[PDB]
Amino acid sequence: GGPSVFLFPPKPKDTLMISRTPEVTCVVVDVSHEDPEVKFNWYVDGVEVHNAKTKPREEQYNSTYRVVSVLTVLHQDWLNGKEYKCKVSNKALPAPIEKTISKAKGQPREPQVYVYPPSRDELTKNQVSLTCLVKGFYPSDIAVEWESNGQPENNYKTTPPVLDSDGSFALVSKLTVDKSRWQQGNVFSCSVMHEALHNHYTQKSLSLSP
Amino acid sequence: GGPSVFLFPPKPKDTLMISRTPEVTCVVVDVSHEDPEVKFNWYVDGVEVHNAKTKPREEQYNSTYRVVSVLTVLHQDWLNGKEYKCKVSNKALPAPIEKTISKAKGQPREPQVYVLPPSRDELTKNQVSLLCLVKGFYPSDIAVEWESNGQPENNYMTWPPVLDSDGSFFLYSKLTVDKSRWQQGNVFSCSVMHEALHNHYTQKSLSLSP
Ligand SMILES: *[C@@H]1O[C@H](CO[C@@H]2O[C@@H](C)[C@@H](O)[C@@H](O)[C@@H]2O)[C@@H](O[C@@H]2O[C@H](CO)[C@@H](O[C@@H]3O[C@H](CO[C@H]4O[C@H](CO)[C@@H](O)[C@H](O)[C@@H]4O[C@@H]4O[C@H](CO)[C@@H](O[C@@H]5O[C@H](CO)[C@H](O)[C@H](O)[C@H]5O)[C@H](O)[C@H]4NC(C)=O)[C@@H](O)[C@H](O)[C@@H]3O)[C@H](O)[C@H]2NC(C)=O)[C@H](O)[C@H]1NC(C)=O
Ligand SMILES: *[C@@H]1O[C@H](CO[C@@H]2O[C@@H](C)[C@@H](O)[C@@H](O)[C@@H]2O)[C@@H](O)[C@H](O)[C@H]1NC(C)=O
């Protein structure tokens, strides 16, 4: 019993793309009204930082509070495997609970990215399926998104990555588009962001030839 | 105290192909030497049935008994949503344990099956990928396989069903083949089994087009 703590990594797009803002998130739940006092300490490979921000306690429908501290990280430190430990001390806690987290381990492997046009068979339908295969990648942390004419084309689902027969990961993203738009000759591109890619980024395109 | 029961359903493929035998399996573990008699009572939509096969108890390395009862189900009973209950009595229980399982609920929707050849970009590799897209199905229970030349294929992986925006599921399977085989004109076939297909089965084939 007493309060519990969960420790969450940044989003992979946030670590990979230099303008974005990667954060590690330390969540405290089951904080009591009678002992609501929660202090956070943060450490990066065992050294303390003070740039974190702790949110005010928040009451849950279950009568306990939720406490959070968000610690923005340097993209480089996360990608280099630096260790992030959040320390939670609370009256109800005879001993501090410490969770640590860091990037997924393993030697990087550059994803191979392919796009696939719609089946001949599928053209009978009001919509068509553009397919993006990403395989050979390691670790599994990855972001895959679609767009057309610079604009997010968000009408898509993606398999979570799963292990292939050579020990790497693969996944497939499916964007659904109007056959007409496909027929209108519009270009669609698959965007892939992964630590192994140069610039962390590659985009592959397809369209119907005039 | 108490021994515990776990009740497992049949494999979807076994419920779909008439040549196969679908089974509901009731597994009682953590039974003791002092109270070893286990009796099963099986009900299908509440009507007791008498045809299950029970196996002799077998001692586990924790010095407990494992006792498994196998009930053959009729394909169409399962597909029609019948409820199978296994009841297990033992003297170390405050009373019998009951467990009931049945097929996933929801209006079934017919899979749509597409096959896509490898992208021209991939042909410059030692192995290639052929994709099988199966979408718009419901429930998620499904079996997908690949063969060629009258042999099944050994080199595929199939991602879990993904819930699509329209409430249905889709999934992909990826068959990897040496480019030579592909370039040699060999035919590859994706076979999909699902309750909402006529005959519970469809197959789509592709080959290299010169
Ligand atoms: C004492 O020991 C027992 C037995 O354990 C064994 O012996 C001990 C000494 C050790 O050596 C162990 O390493 C060894 O396993 C132990 O029993 C276990 O108890 C725990 C709970 O406390 C059970 O845990 C549950 O497991 C559920 C999932 O179990 C399935 O998957 C696991 C692998 O993840 C298998 O090990 C299980 O056997 C079971 O496998 C499933 O089995 C069914 C029925 O046979 C298969 O379905 C049927 O398949 C056939 C074809 O084969 C047809 O398709 C049929 O139509 C179909 O019905 C099914 O395919 C298979 N699945 C897989 C993935 O293989 C889980 O859901 C629960 O939430 C829970 O975790 C555990 O199962 C159980 N082990 C058993 C029975 O072997 C005791 O706990 C120990 N006691 C103490 C006090 O220590
Ligand atoms: C108390 O609630 C915490 C927050 O859980 C979230 O909101 C609660 C009320 C539920 O609605 C749940 O759906 C959400 O995940 C939990 O993390 C915590 O474990 C809960 N504590 C207890 C003792 O139940």
PDB file of all heavy atoms in Angstrom, chain A residues 12 20-21 53 57-58 62 72 83-84 106 110 118-121 130 136 151 154 159 171 187-188 195 198 207:
ATOM      1  N   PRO A  12       8.798   8.795 -29.268  1.00  0.00           N
ATOM      2  CA  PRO A  12       9.944   8.674 -30.147  1.00  0.00           C
ATOM      3  C   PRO A  12      10.100   9.845 -31.147  1.00  0.00           C
ATOM      4  O   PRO A  12      11.223  10.296 -31.389  1.00  0.00           O
ATOM      5  CB  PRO A  12       9.715   7.323 -30.839  1.00  0.00           C
ATOM      6  CG  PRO A  12       8.951   6.529 -29.823  1.00  0.00           C
ATOM      7  CD  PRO A  12       8.066   7.520 -29.108  1.00  0.00           C
ATOM      8  N   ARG A  20      11.456  19.369 -31.603  1.00  0.00           N
ATOM      9  CA  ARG A  20      10.408  18.945 -30.669  1.00  0.00           C
ATOM     10  C   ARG A  20      10.955  18.786 -29.265  1.00  0.00           C
ATOM     11  O   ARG A  20      12.148  18.900 -29.043  1.00  0.00           O
ATOM     12  CB  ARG A  20       9.681  17.674 -31.168  1.00  0.00           C
ATOM     13  CG  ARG A  20       8.996  17.892 -32.518  1.00  0.00           C
ATOM     14  CD  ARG A  20       8.391  16.611 -33.079  1.00  0.00           C
ATOM     15  NE  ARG A  20       7.226  16.155 -32.329  1.00  0.00           N
ATOM     16  CZ  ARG A  20       5.979  16.500 -32.636  1.00  0.00           C
ATOM     17  NH1 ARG A  20       5.764  17.306 -33.665  1.00  0.00           N
ATOM     18  NH2 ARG A  20       4.961  16.040 -31.924  1.00  0.00           N
ATOM     19  N   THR A  21      10.061  18.525 -28.317  1.00  0.00           N
ATOM     20  CA  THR A  21      10.376  18.639 -26.911  1.00  0.00           C
ATOM     21  C   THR A  21      10.180  17.293 -26.178  1.00  0.00           C
ATOM     22  O   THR A  21       9.087  16.996 -25.719  1.00  0.00           O
ATOM     23  CB  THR A  21       9.404  19.659 -26.278  1.00  0.00           C
ATOM     24  OG1 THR A  21       9.425  20.882 -27.035  1.00  0.00           O
ATOM     25  CG2 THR A  21       9.770  19.930 -24.854  1.00  0.00           C
ATOM     26  N   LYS A  53       9.561  19.957 -13.565  1.00  0.00           N
ATOM     27  CA  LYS A  53       8.425  20.720 -13.109  1.00  0.00           C
ATOM     28  C   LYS A  53       7.386  19.771 -12.543  1.00  0.00           C
ATOM     29  O   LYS A  53       6.979  18.806 -13.202  1.00  0.00           O
ATOM     30  CB  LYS A  53       7.853  21.578 -14.236  1.00  0.00           C
ATOM     31  CG  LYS A  53       8.841  22.616 -14.757  1.00  0.00           C
ATOM     32  CD  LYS A  53       9.502  23.387 -13.620  1.00  0.00           C
ATOM     33  CE  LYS A  53      10.843  23.964 -14.063  1.00  0.00           C
ATOM     34  NZ  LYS A  53      11.402  24.971 -13.117  1.00  0.00           N
ATOM     35  N   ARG A  57      -0.883  18.447  -7.020  1.00  0.00           N
ATOM     36  CA  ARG A  57      -1.648  17.228  -6.776  1.00  0.00           C
ATOM     37  C   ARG A  57      -3.051  17.327  -7.358  1.00  0.00           C
ATOM     38  O   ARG A  57      -3.684  18.386  -7.305  1.00  0.00           O
ATOM     39  CB  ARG A  57      -1.750  16.966  -5.276  1.00  0.00           C
ATOM     40  CG  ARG A  57      -2.361  18.117  -4.496  1.00  0.00           C
ATOM     41  CD  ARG A  57      -2.647  17.720  -3.054  1.00  0.00           C
ATOM     42  NE  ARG A  57      -2.669  18.881  -2.171  1.00  0.00           N
ATOM     43  CZ  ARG A  57      -3.680  19.738  -2.091  1.00  0.00           C
ATOM     44  NH1 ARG A  57      -4.760  19.568  -2.841  1.00  0.00           N
ATOM     45  NH2 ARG A  57      -3.611  20.769  -1.261  1.00  0.00           N
ATOM     46  N   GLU A  58      -3.546  16.210  -7.887  1.00  0.00           N
ATOM     47  CA  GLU A  58      -4.873  16.174  -8.499  1.00  0.00           C
ATOM     48  C   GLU A  58      -5.716  15.001  -7.988  1.00  0.00           C
ATOM     49  O   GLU A  58      -5.297  13.847  -8.053  1.00  0.00           O
ATOM     50  CB  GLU A  58      -4.747  16.125 -10.027  1.00  0.00           C
ATOM     51  CG  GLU A  58      -5.989  16.579 -10.774  1.00  0.00           C
ATOM     52  CD  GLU A  58      -5.673  17.066 -12.176  1.00  0.00           C
ATOM     53  OE1 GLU A  58      -4.750  16.506 -12.810  1.00  0.00           O
ATOM     54  OE2 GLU A  58      -6.344  18.013 -12.639  1.00  0.00           O
ATOM     55  N   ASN A  62     -11.389   8.222  -7.324  1.00  0.00           N
ATOM     56  CA  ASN A  62     -11.242   7.231  -6.275  1.00  0.00           C
ATOM     57  C   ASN A  62     -10.707   7.809  -4.981  1.00  0.00           C
ATOM     58  O   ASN A  62     -10.331   7.085  -4.089  1.00  0.00           O
ATOM     59  CB  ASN A  62     -10.437   6.006  -6.740  1.00  0.00           C
ATOM     60  CG  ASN A  62      -8.969   6.315  -6.989  1.00  0.00           C
ATOM     61  OD1 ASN A  62      -8.460   7.312  -6.531  1.00  0.00           O
ATOM     62  ND2 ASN A  62      -8.293   5.433  -7.703  1.00  0.00           N
ATOM     63  N   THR A  72      12.067  17.582 -18.977  1.00  0.00           N
ATOM     64  CA  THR A  72      12.445  17.686 -20.385  1.00  0.00           C
ATOM     65  C   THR A  72      13.869  17.186 -20.511  1.00  0.00           C
ATOM     66  O   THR A  72      14.695  17.484 -19.655  1.00  0.00           O
ATOM     67  CB  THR A  72      12.401  19.149 -20.862  1.00  0.00           C
ATOM     68  OG1 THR A  72      11.078  19.687 -20.688  1.00  0.00           O
ATOM     69  CG2 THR A  72      12.793  19.234 -22.318  1.00  0.00           C
ATOM     70  N   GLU A  83      20.660   7.431 -18.294  1.00  0.00           N
ATOM     71  CA  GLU A  83      19.659   6.862 -17.393  1.00  0.00           C
ATOM     72  C   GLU A  83      18.922   7.929 -16.606  1.00  0.00           C
ATOM     73  O   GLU A  83      19.535   8.852 -16.048  1.00  0.00           O
ATOM     74  CB  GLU A  83      20.305   5.833 -16.441  1.00  0.00           C
ATOM     75  CG  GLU A  83      20.859   4.603 -17.156  1.00  0.00           C
ATOM     76  CD  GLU A  83      21.387   3.538 -16.200  1.00  0.00           C
ATOM     77  OE1 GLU A  83      21.912   3.911 -15.137  1.00  0.00           O
ATOM     78  OE2 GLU A  83      21.284   2.326 -16.516  1.00  0.00           O
ATOM     79  N   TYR A  84      17.600   7.815 -16.578  1.00  0.00           N
ATOM     80  CA  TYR A  84      16.766   8.806 -15.910  1.00  0.00           C
ATOM     81  C   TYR A  84      16.050   8.145 -14.748  1.00  0.00           C
ATOM     82  O   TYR A  84      15.235   7.245 -14.942  1.00  0.00           O
ATOM     83  CB  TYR A  84      15.771   9.429 -16.904  1.00  0.00           C
ATOM     84  CG  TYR A  84      16.478  10.180 -18.007  1.00  0.00           C
ATOM     85  CD1 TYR A  84      16.958   9.510 -19.126  1.00  0.00           C
ATOM     86  CD2 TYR A  84      16.713  11.548 -17.910  1.00  0.00           C
ATOM     87  CE1 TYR A  84      17.659  10.178 -20.119  1.00  0.00           C
ATOM     88  CE2 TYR A  84      17.398  12.231 -18.907  1.00  0.00           C
ATOM     89  CZ  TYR A  84      17.862  11.537 -20.010  1.00  0.00           C
ATOM     90  OH  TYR A  84      18.537  12.209 -21.015  1.00  0.00           O
ATOM     91  N   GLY A 106      20.108  -1.945 -27.756  1.00  0.00           N
ATOM     92  CA  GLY A 106      20.431  -2.695 -28.960  1.00  0.00           C
ATOM     93  C   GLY A 106      21.209  -1.860 -29.948  1.00  0.00           C
ATOM     94  O   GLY A 106      21.182  -0.618 -29.893  1.00  0.00           O
ATOM     95  N   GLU A 110      19.090   0.314 -39.557  1.00  0.00           N
ATOM     96  CA  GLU A 110      18.379   1.250 -40.400  1.00  0.00           C
ATOM     97  C   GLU A 110      17.149   0.610 -41.052  1.00  0.00           C
ATOM     98  O   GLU A 110      17.274  -0.343 -41.810  1.00  0.00           O
ATOM     99  CB  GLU A 110      19.351   1.700 -41.497  1.00  0.00           C
ATOM    100  CG  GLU A 110      18.822   2.764 -42.430  1.00  0.00           C
ATOM    101  CD  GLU A 110      19.892   3.294 -43.368  1.00  0.00           C
ATOM    102  OE1 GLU A 110      21.087   3.028 -43.133  1.00  0.00           O
ATOM    103  OE2 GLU A 110      19.531   3.959 -44.360  1.00  0.00           O
ATOM    104  N   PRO A 118      -2.247   0.499 -54.459  1.00  0.00           N
ATOM    105  CA  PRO A 118      -3.428  -0.339 -54.265  1.00  0.00           C
ATOM    106  C   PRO A 118      -3.468  -1.541 -55.205  1.00  0.00           C
ATOM    107  O   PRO A 118      -3.075  -1.441 -56.368  1.00  0.00           O
ATOM    108  CB  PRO A 118      -4.597   0.594 -54.602  1.00  0.00           C
ATOM    109  CG  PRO A 118      -4.024   1.989 -54.670  1.00  0.00           C
ATOM    110  CD  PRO A 118      -2.583   1.820 -55.025  1.00  0.00           C
ATOM    111  N   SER A 119      -3.977  -2.653 -54.698  1.00  0.00           N
ATOM    112  CA  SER A 119      -4.306  -3.814 -55.527  1.00  0.00           C
ATOM    113  C   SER A 119      -5.161  -3.408 -56.739  1.00  0.00           C
ATOM    114  O   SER A 119      -6.039  -2.562 -56.631  1.00  0.00           O
ATOM    115  CB  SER A 119      -5.088  -4.843 -54.694  1.00  0.00           C
ATOM    116  OG  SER A 119      -5.753  -5.783 -55.535  1.00  0.00           O
ATOM    117  N   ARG A 120      -4.924  -4.037 -57.888  1.00  0.00           N
ATOM    118  CA  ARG A 120      -5.883  -3.944 -58.992  1.00  0.00           C
ATOM    119  C   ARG A 120      -7.318  -4.238 -58.502  1.00  0.00           C
ATOM    120  O   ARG A 120      -8.263  -3.484 -58.792  1.00  0.00           O
ATOM    121  CB  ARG A 120      -5.492  -4.901 -60.136  1.00  0.00           C
ATOM    122  CG  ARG A 120      -6.462  -4.914 -61.310  1.00  0.00           C
ATOM    123  CD  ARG A 120      -5.877  -4.276 -62.568  1.00  0.00           C
ATOM    124  NE  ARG A 120      -5.301  -2.948 -62.324  1.00  0.00           N
ATOM    125  CZ  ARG A 120      -5.114  -2.024 -63.264  1.00  0.00           C
ATOM    126  NH1 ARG A 120      -5.471  -2.271 -64.518  1.00  0.00           N
ATOM    127  NH2 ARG A 120      -4.577  -0.848 -62.949  1.00  0.00           N
ATOM    128  N   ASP A 121      -7.471  -5.329 -57.753  1.00  0.00           N
ATOM    129  CA  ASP A 121      -8.765  -5.734 -57.204  1.00  0.00           C
ATOM    130  C   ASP A 121      -9.470  -4.645 -56.382  1.00  0.00           C
ATOM    131  O   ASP A 121     -10.699  -4.593 -56.343  1.00  0.00           O
ATOM    132  CB  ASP A 121      -8.629  -6.991 -56.323  1.00  0.00           C
ATOM    133  CG  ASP A 121      -8.174  -8.229 -57.095  1.00  0.00           C
ATOM    134  OD1 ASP A 121      -7.804  -8.132 -58.297  1.00  0.00           O
ATOM    135  OD2 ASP A 121      -8.175  -9.321 -56.470  1.00  0.00           O
ATOM    136  N   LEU A 130      -3.234   2.517 -49.462  1.00  0.00           N
ATOM    137  CA  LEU A 130      -1.824   2.724 -49.692  1.00  0.00           C
ATOM    138  C   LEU A 130      -1.092   2.145 -48.508  1.00  0.00           C
ATOM    139  O   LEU A 130      -1.427   2.416 -47.356  1.00  0.00           O
ATOM    140  CB  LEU A 130      -1.486   4.210 -49.855  1.00  0.00           C
ATOM    141  CG  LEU A 130      -2.053   4.862 -51.134  1.00  0.00           C
ATOM    142  CD1 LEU A 130      -1.421   6.232 -51.366  1.00  0.00           C
ATOM    143  CD2 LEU A 130      -1.899   4.005 -52.376  1.00  0.00           C
ATOM    144  N   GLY A 136      13.414  -4.316 -41.005  1.00  0.00           N
ATOM    145  CA  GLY A 136      14.853  -4.364 -40.739  1.00  0.00           C
ATOM    146  C   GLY A 136      15.330  -3.423 -39.644  1.00  0.00           C
ATOM    147  O   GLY A 136      16.531  -3.312 -39.411  1.00  0.00           O
ATOM    148  N   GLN A 151       0.423  18.478 -46.175  1.00  0.00           N
ATOM    149  CA  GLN A 151      -0.594  18.431 -45.132  1.00  0.00           C
ATOM    150  C   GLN A 151      -0.673  17.012 -44.576  1.00  0.00           C
ATOM    151  O   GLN A 151      -0.617  16.047 -45.339  1.00  0.00           O
ATOM    152  CB  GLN A 151      -1.948  18.842 -45.714  1.00  0.00           C
ATOM    153  CG  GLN A 151      -2.003  20.297 -46.162  1.00  0.00           C
ATOM    154  CD  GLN A 151      -1.739  21.251 -45.014  1.00  0.00           C
ATOM    155  OE1 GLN A 151      -2.465  21.256 -44.023  1.00  0.00           O
ATOM    156  NE2 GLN A 151      -0.700  22.071 -45.147  1.00  0.00           N
ATOM    157  N   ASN A 154      -3.994  11.839 -42.218  1.00  0.00           N
ATOM    158  CA  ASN A 154      -3.960  11.172 -40.951  1.00  0.00           C
ATOM    159  C   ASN A 154      -4.952  10.037 -40.939  1.00  0.00           C
ATOM    160  O   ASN A 154      -5.243   9.460 -39.893  1.00  0.00           O
ATOM    161  CB  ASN A 154      -4.238  12.167 -39.824  1.00  0.00           C
ATOM    162  CG  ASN A 154      -3.072  13.099 -39.586  1.00  0.00           C
ATOM    163  OD1 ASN A 154      -1.978  12.865 -40.100  1.00  0.00           O
ATOM    164  ND2 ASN A 154      -3.289  14.169 -38.801  1.00  0.00           N
ATOM    165  N   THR A 159       0.349  -1.121 -37.769  1.00  0.00           N
ATOM    166  CA  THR A 159       0.619  -2.246 -36.881  1.00  0.00           C
ATOM    167  C   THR A 159       1.691  -1.800 -35.880  1.00  0.00           C
ATOM    168  O   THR A 159       2.653  -1.139 -36.251  1.00  0.00           O
ATOM    169  CB  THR A 159       1.158  -3.486 -37.650  1.00  0.00           C
ATOM    170  OG1 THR A 159       2.500  -3.230 -38.117  1.00  0.00           O
ATOM    171  CG2 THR A 159       0.271  -3.818 -38.855  1.00  0.00           C
ATOM    172  N   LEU A 171       6.988  -3.367 -39.501  1.00  0.00           N
ATOM    173  CA  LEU A 171       5.623  -2.942 -39.294  1.00  0.00           C
ATOM    174  C   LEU A 171       5.079  -2.474 -40.628  1.00  0.00           C
ATOM    175  O   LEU A 171       5.835  -2.292 -41.582  1.00  0.00           O
ATOM    176  CB  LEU A 171       5.565  -1.824 -38.241  1.00  0.00           C
ATOM    177  CG  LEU A 171       6.332  -0.538 -38.587  1.00  0.00           C
ATOM    178  CD1 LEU A 171       5.561   0.258 -39.632  1.00  0.00           C
ATOM    179  CD2 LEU A 171       6.406   0.304 -37.314  1.00  0.00           C
ATOM    180  N   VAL A 187       0.029  12.783 -55.151  1.00  0.00           N
ATOM    181  CA  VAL A 187       1.156  12.078 -54.586  1.00  0.00           C
ATOM    182  C   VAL A 187       0.939  11.937 -53.082  1.00  0.00           C
ATOM    183  O   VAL A 187       0.431  12.850 -52.402  1.00  0.00           O
ATOM    184  CB  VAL A 187       2.503  12.789 -54.892  1.00  0.00           C
ATOM    185  CG1 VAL A 187       3.667  12.074 -54.225  1.00  0.00           C
ATOM    186  CG2 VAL A 187       2.734  12.867 -56.393  1.00  0.00           C
ATOM    187  N   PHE A 188       1.287  10.759 -52.578  1.00  0.00           N
ATOM    188  CA  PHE A 188       1.211  10.492 -51.163  1.00  0.00           C
ATOM    189  C   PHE A 188       2.564   9.977 -50.713  1.00  0.00           C
ATOM    190  O   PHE A 188       3.172   9.187 -51.408  1.00  0.00           O
ATOM    191  CB  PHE A 188       0.132   9.434 -50.926  1.00  0.00           C
ATOM    192  CG  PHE A 188      -1.229   9.878 -51.368  1.00  0.00           C
ATOM    193  CD1 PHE A 188      -1.674   9.639 -52.659  1.00  0.00           C
ATOM    194  CD2 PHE A 188      -2.041  10.583 -50.507  1.00  0.00           C
ATOM    195  CE1 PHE A 188      -2.921  10.084 -53.075  1.00  0.00           C
ATOM    196  CE2 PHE A 188      -3.281  11.026 -50.914  1.00  0.00           C
ATOM    197  CZ  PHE A 188      -3.734  10.763 -52.192  1.00  0.00           C
ATOM    198  N   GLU A 195      16.025   6.386 -35.149  1.00  0.00           N
ATOM    199  CA  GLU A 195      17.383   6.778 -34.761  1.00  0.00           C
ATOM    200  C   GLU A 195      18.454   6.314 -35.762  1.00  0.00           C
ATOM    201  O   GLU A 195      19.501   6.968 -35.904  1.00  0.00           O
ATOM    202  CB  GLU A 195      17.707   6.263 -33.360  1.00  0.00           C
ATOM    203  CG  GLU A 195      17.619   4.747 -33.253  1.00  0.00           C
ATOM    204  CD  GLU A 195      17.589   4.269 -31.809  1.00  0.00           C
ATOM    205  OE1 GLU A 195      16.522   4.318 -31.163  1.00  0.00           O
ATOM    206  OE2 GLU A 195      18.642   3.831 -31.331  1.00  0.00           O
ATOM    207  N   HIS A 198      19.762   8.356 -41.364  1.00  0.00           N
ATOM    208  CA  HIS A 198      20.473   9.608 -41.421  1.00  0.00           C
ATOM    209  C   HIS A 198      19.477  10.772 -41.280  1.00  0.00           C
ATOM    210  O   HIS A 198      18.368  10.733 -41.812  1.00  0.00           O
ATOM    211  CB  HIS A 198      21.298   9.730 -42.702  1.00  0.00           C
ATOM    212  CG  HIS A 198      22.252  10.880 -42.670  1.00  0.00           C
ATOM    213  ND1 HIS A 198      22.048  12.041 -43.385  1.00  0.00           N
ATOM    214  CD2 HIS A 198      23.382  11.077 -41.951  1.00  0.00           C
ATOM    215  CE1 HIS A 198      23.029  12.890 -43.133  1.00  0.00           C
ATOM    216  NE2 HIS A 198      23.853  12.327 -42.270  1.00  0.00           N
ATOM    217  N   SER A 207       2.326   7.518 -56.457  1.00  0.00           N
ATOM    218  CA  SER A 207       1.181   8.144 -57.088  1.00  0.00           C
ATOM    219  C   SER A 207       0.841   7.343 -58.312  1.00  0.00           C
ATOM    220  O   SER A 207       1.593   6.452 -58.695  1.00  0.00           O
ATOM    221  CB  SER A 207       1.511   9.583 -57.494  1.00  0.00           C
ATOM    222  OG  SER A 207       2.576   9.600 -58.428  1.00  0.00           O
TER     223      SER A 207
END
